[PDB]
Design a protein around this ligand. Structure first.
Ligand SMILES: O=P(O)(O)OC[C@H](O)[C@@H](O)C(O)NO
Ligand SMILES: O=P(O)(O)OC[C@H](O)[C@@H](O)C(O)NO
Ligand SMILES: [Mg+2]
Ligand SMILES: [Mg+2]
Lengths: 215, 215
């Protein structure tokens, strides 16, 4: 209370990303360098966006799977505030990313996309990780996987373990009431903001509905 | 058939990578754009390296965790031959990456590490995936994880299921005999070639040892 709003910049080039930021940067709390942008442009995307929007939290959605220390340091030397580690990373990778995060006063989020287990979730807590991103995969969504009660149950379980939980994955405005009454940290929207006829109205509607559902 | 040798370019900038490729491009079979290089420079690394060495197999070690079709296509449009998909990816991510690979006459490898299961391995096979990378995480290695028996058994079992198995993760020359007798497709060396006093002789020593052990 209130859940923040994060825009995902899943763009292949910086100029494509800026078509969105130039409209909605001030309409959101967190600016994400999407994995698609990380791979498209590399870590310069993190450096550039933080330089443009230093007052915003910048998330480097690098989905680190190994070399936690090296990749985390690259992101944080580019001035990221937060970085993601994919759920299957070895626990030493997550720990390493977090050690480096702490040098920069940043933070690590575990990206829960695809396969993971409740035992891994406990390991993350024991290592001092305090953020997870409960993510429906884009590809799972495209094969017809809807949000369901099992998601709500799992989100609540993660919250109860002590994680600040981010909810994402093809979120539409209408999805937001599903999560009512859960202390969600952040809602991410990429396509439903970037690709809206009016990105400004789409971001303000997200913010409106959040304020209504968590006032 | 002799295991091939792949060099991993886990460099933060193209120029650092090229300090290695100018010495060993012709001394190895596969040139890998390491995840660290993909994140440092973005997908231009793939395009640039393939342009230098168009006769060599170039692997984009992107460790795709979601958006299989998009990230796959970015890599393949940059002229990659092979791309990696991290083992926890939703099965549709893996399938989407493969579908794109096939349009480019390329291929996908599932990068194993973290946690994964044998039923998941069977899903990969059923989906048409024909390569896996049995990797010891750099961070696990740093925490003292050694190559052992459980690894030989798992590698053998993966091979019997029909995968071509690449073995990687801080490999030193001295590790190769651990895997003798198994039809390994590829051994990857990053640090043990790049950081050798003489990268050329390091690569040659690996090829000599391979030739002895699999001859
Ligand atoms: O709302 P979307 O277009 O799905 O984008 C947000 C999502 O979190 C992606 O950035 C992502 O990381 N998917 O894995
Ligand atoms: O021999 P290394 O320095 O461990 O590098 C090879 C390894 O496969 C890495 O490139 C990697 O992908 N690690 O996850
Ligand atoms: Mg993202
Ligand atoms: Mg690699």
């Amino acid at each position: 209370s209130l859940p923040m709003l994060q825009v995902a910049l899943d763009n292949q080039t910086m100029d494509s990303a800026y078509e969105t930021t130039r409209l909605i940067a001030e309409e959101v709390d967190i600016i994400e360098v999407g994995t698609i942008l990380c791979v498209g442009e590399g870590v310069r995307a993190v450096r550039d966006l933080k330089a443009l929007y230093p007052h915003k939290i910048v998330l480097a959605d690098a989905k680190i799977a190994d070399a936690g220390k090296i990749l985390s340091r690259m992101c944080f030397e580019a001035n990221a505030d937060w970085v993601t580690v994919i759920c299957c990373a070895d626990i030493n990778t997550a720990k390493g990313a977090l050690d480096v995060a702490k040098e920069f006063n940043g933070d690590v989020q575990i990206q829960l996309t695809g396969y993971w287990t409740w035992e891994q979730a406990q390991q993350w807590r024991d290592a001092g990780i305090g953020q997870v991103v409960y993510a429906r995969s884009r590809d799972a969504q495209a094969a017809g996987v809807a949000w369901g009660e099992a998601d709500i149950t799992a989100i609540k379980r993660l919250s109860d373990m002590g994680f600040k939980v981010t909810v994402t994955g093809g979120l539409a405005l209408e999805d937001l009431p599903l999560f009512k009454g859960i202390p969600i940290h952040v809602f991410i929207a990429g396509r439903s903001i970037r690709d809206a006829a009016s990105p400004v109205e789409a971001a303000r509607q997200f913010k409106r509905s959040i304020a209504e559902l968590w006032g």
